[PDB]
Design an enzyme around this catalytic site. Structure first.
Site, PDB file in Angstrom:
ATOM      1  N   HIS A 165     -10.403   1.086   0.447  1.00  0.00           N
ATOM      2  CA  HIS A 165      -9.992   2.422   0.893  1.00  0.00           C
ATOM      3  C   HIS A 165     -11.160   3.385   1.073  1.00  0.00           C
ATOM      4  CE1 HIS A 165      -5.751   2.225   1.281  1.00  0.00           C
ATOM      5  NE2 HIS A 165      -5.539   1.879   0.024  1.00  0.00           N
TER       6      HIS A 165
ATOM      7  N   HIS B 181      -8.957  -3.889  -3.307  1.00  0.00           N
ATOM      8  CA  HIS B 181      -8.034  -3.143  -2.456  1.00  0.00           C
ATOM      9  C   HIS B 181      -8.416  -1.649  -2.484  1.00  0.00           C
ATOM     10  CE1 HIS B 181      -3.773  -2.556  -0.802  1.00  0.00           C
ATOM     11  NE2 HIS B 181      -4.078  -1.341  -1.220  1.00  0.00           N
ATOM     12  N   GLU B 182      -8.624  -1.103  -3.682  1.00  0.00           N
ATOM     13  CA  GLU B 182      -9.029   0.295  -3.851  1.00  0.00           C
ATOM     14  C   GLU B 182     -10.382   0.655  -3.251  1.00  0.00           C
ATOM     15  OE1 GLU B 182      -6.719   2.257  -4.314  1.00  0.00           O
ATOM     16  OE2 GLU B 182      -5.487   0.539  -4.922  1.00  0.00           O
TER      17      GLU B 182
ATOM     18  N   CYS C  85       0.837  -1.194   0.000  1.00  0.00           N
ATOM     19  CA  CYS C  85       0.000   0.000   0.000  1.00  0.00           C
ATOM     20  C   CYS C  85       0.865   1.233   0.000  1.00  0.00           C
ATOM     21  CB  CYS C  85      -0.895  -0.019   1.242  1.00  0.00           C
ATOM     22  SG  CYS C  85      -2.307   1.062   1.084  1.00  0.00           S
TER      23      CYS C  85
HETATM   24  C1  LIG Z   1      -2.889  -4.939  -4.785  1.00  0.00           C
HETATM   25  C2  LIG Z   1      -3.172  -3.530  -4.402  1.00  0.00           C
HETATM   26  C3  LIG Z   1      -1.871  -2.789  -4.444  1.00  0.00           C
HETATM   27  C4  LIG Z   1      -2.109  -1.295  -4.569  1.00  0.00           C
HETATM   28  C5  LIG Z   1      -0.809  -0.542  -4.283  1.00  0.00           C
HETATM   29  C6  LIG Z   1      -1.086   0.950  -4.337  1.00  0.00           C
HETATM   30  N1  LIG Z   1      -1.979   1.330  -3.257  1.00  0.00           N
HETATM   31  O1  LIG Z   1      -1.532   1.589  -2.236  1.00  0.00           O
HETATM   32  C7  LIG Z   1      -3.308   1.384  -3.401  1.00  0.00           C
HETATM   33  O2  LIG Z   1      -4.038   1.604  -2.466  1.00  0.00           O
HETATM   34  C8  LIG Z   1       0.189  -0.916  -5.347  1.00  0.00           C
HETATM   35  O3  LIG Z   1      -0.104  -0.682  -6.494  1.00  0.00           O
HETATM   36  C9  LIG Z   1       1.486  -1.690  -4.964  1.00  0.00           C
HETATM   37  N2  LIG Z   1       2.356  -1.756  -6.114  1.00  0.00           N
HETATM   38  C10 LIG Z   1       2.275  -2.561  -7.117  1.00  0.00           C
HETATM   39  O4  LIG Z   1       1.367  -3.342  -7.177  1.00  0.00           O
HETATM   40  N3  LIG Z   1       3.243  -2.451  -8.014  1.00  0.00           N
HETATM   41  C11 LIG Z   1       3.154  -3.070  -9.155  1.00  0.00           C
HETATM   42  C12 LIG Z   1       2.740  -4.355  -9.375  1.00  0.00           C
HETATM   43  C13 LIG Z   1       2.667  -4.792 -10.685  1.00  0.00           C
HETATM   44  C14 LIG Z   1       2.959  -3.947 -11.740  1.00  0.00           C
HETATM   45  C15 LIG Z   1       3.347  -2.653 -11.505  1.00  0.00           C
HETATM   46  C16 LIG Z   1       3.430  -2.238 -10.200  1.00  0.00           C
HETATM   47  F1  LIG Z   1       3.671  -1.364  -9.991  1.00  0.00           F
HETATM   48  C17 LIG Z   1       2.505  -0.996  -4.070  1.00  0.00           C
HETATM   49  C18 LIG Z   1       2.130   0.420  -3.690  1.00  0.00           C
HETATM   50  C19 LIG Z   1       2.844  -1.906  -2.904  1.00  0.00           C
HETATM   51 ZN   LIG Z   2      -3.555   0.842  -0.687  1.00  0.00          ZN
END
Ligand SMILES: CCCC[C@H](CN(O)C=O)C(=O)[C@@H](NC(=O)Nc1ccccc1F)C(C)C
Ligand SMILES: [Zn+2]
Length: 185
Positions: A158, A154-155, A111
């Site tokens: 929030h 996940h979104e 996150c």
């Molecule tokens: C499963 C929910 C995760 C949501 C969170 C953001 N978030 O905090 C939302 O509330 C991310 O997106 C996580 N990153 C990735 O997934 N990176 C990643 C993976 C594959 C391809 C490209 C990429 F960047 C990191 C922030 C841990």
């Molecule tokens: Zn998150």
């Protein structure tokens, strides 16, 4: 341009509130906010831009994470590539139906608002149907399976003041539920 300084940290009250539904049509400011959320994800995924602005790469962002208690999310999942990719800015998204079958990423979730890696499986529905509006107030219905299903859940979490680690079992964080599907990231 949003950067990490726009992302509020775990412990901030806004992340624990239930975000307010949007009135349609969106205000110009709300549209700009949603466009900037998507743009943040785009930038965070560009190697050069992310390095230059110290962006942590993300595939999802919810308005509460930039301290805006409104029910808007952006999701940007690049091609893996089965040729499937997900580029969505959603207003008032709602999960209207879902599979009984669960899914989980084997390394858990991360996150943008949470600095430390949290170990533990986050069981989500393997399949979901979402109804939402888009940025122009038009109607979208998404049928999602596996990884994108997980990301959207996940979104949406929030928007309800729910953090991924809320789902983690304290005693056996790494034990899969029976029949849960392992999803490869
Ligand atoms: C499963 C929910 C995760 C949501 C969170 C953001 N978030 O905090 C939302 O509330 C991310 O997106 C996580 N990153 C990735 O997934 N990176 C990643 C993976 C594959 C391809 C490209 C990429 F960047 C990191 C922030 C841990
Ligand atoms: Zn998150």
């Amino acid at each position: 341009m949003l950067t990490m300084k726009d992302i509020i940290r775990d412990g901030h009250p806004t992340l624990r509130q239930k975000a307010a539904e949007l009135e349609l049509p969106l205000t110009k400011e709300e549209k700009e906010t949603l466009i900037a959320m998507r743009e943040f994800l785009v930038n965070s995924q560009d190697e050069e831009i992310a390095k230059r602005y110290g962006l942590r790469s993300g595939v999802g962002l919810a308005a509460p994470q930039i301290n805006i208690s409104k029910r808007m999310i952006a999701v940007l999942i690049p091609d893996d590539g089965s040729g499937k990719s997900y580029d969505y800015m959603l207003v008032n998204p709602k999960i209207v139906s879902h599979s009984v079958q669960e899914a989980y990423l084997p390394t858990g979730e991360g996150c943008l608002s949470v600095d430390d890696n949290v170990a533990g499986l986050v069981h989500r529905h393997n399949r979901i149907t979402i109804k939402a509006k888009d940025i122009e107030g038009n109607d979208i219905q998404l049928r999602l399976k596996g990884y994108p299903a997980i990301v959207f859940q996940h979104e949406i979490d929030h928007l309800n003041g729910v953090m991924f680690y809320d789902h983690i079992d304290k005693d056996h964080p790494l034990q899969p539920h029976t029949d849960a599907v392992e999803v490869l990231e």
